[PDB]
């Protein structure tokens, strides 16, 4: 139905939110991070979207940490204009968590612990993937968070 807004401006949801032109209007986004290899860009063109796509499968082979700079630059951008930013991958589990909590924890300075807490409680569903949940813990290092 709707995406989940994780902080102001911060929205976490799966595709179907990233084609749905009623609910990115009623809601104030216009940056669509598109955390997937093979989703199209749906509104890009013409319009008034700004888009970036992480090209990345919810797949034990994959590293999406080395798109979090990338990512979380990119949410940054939106957000600090006081425009909405849907971060979405397929189902809206797995990839588009991830890079949130990784956002929550170089943004809001929080341990992986506490930045998963936070979000497992505002969306019950999370299902990162444990390789996913691996990089989330080598990035907290890098953070100096651990």
């Known amino acids: 139905a709707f995406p989940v807004q994780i902080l102001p401006y911060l929205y976490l949801g799966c595709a179907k939110d990233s084609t749905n032109l009623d609910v990115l209007g009623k809601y104030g986004i216009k940056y669509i991070l598109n955390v997937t290899p093979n989703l199209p860009n749906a509104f890009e063109h013409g319009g008034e979207f700004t888009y970036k796509q992480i090209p990345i499968s919810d797949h034990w082979s994959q590293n999406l940490s080395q798109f979090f ?27 588009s968590v991830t890079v949130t909590v990784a956002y929550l924890m170089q943004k809001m300075n929080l341990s992986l612990n506490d930045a998963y807490d ?9 299902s990162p993937n444990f390789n996913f949940m691996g990089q989330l813990l080598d990035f907290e290092r890098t953070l100096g968070l651990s």
């Open 118 to 126: 936070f979000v497992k409680r505002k969306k019950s569903n999370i």
């Open 69 to 95: 700079p990338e990512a979380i630059s990119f949410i940054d951008e939106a957000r600090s204009k006081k425009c909405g930013v849907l971060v979405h991958s397929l189902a809206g589990i797995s990839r």
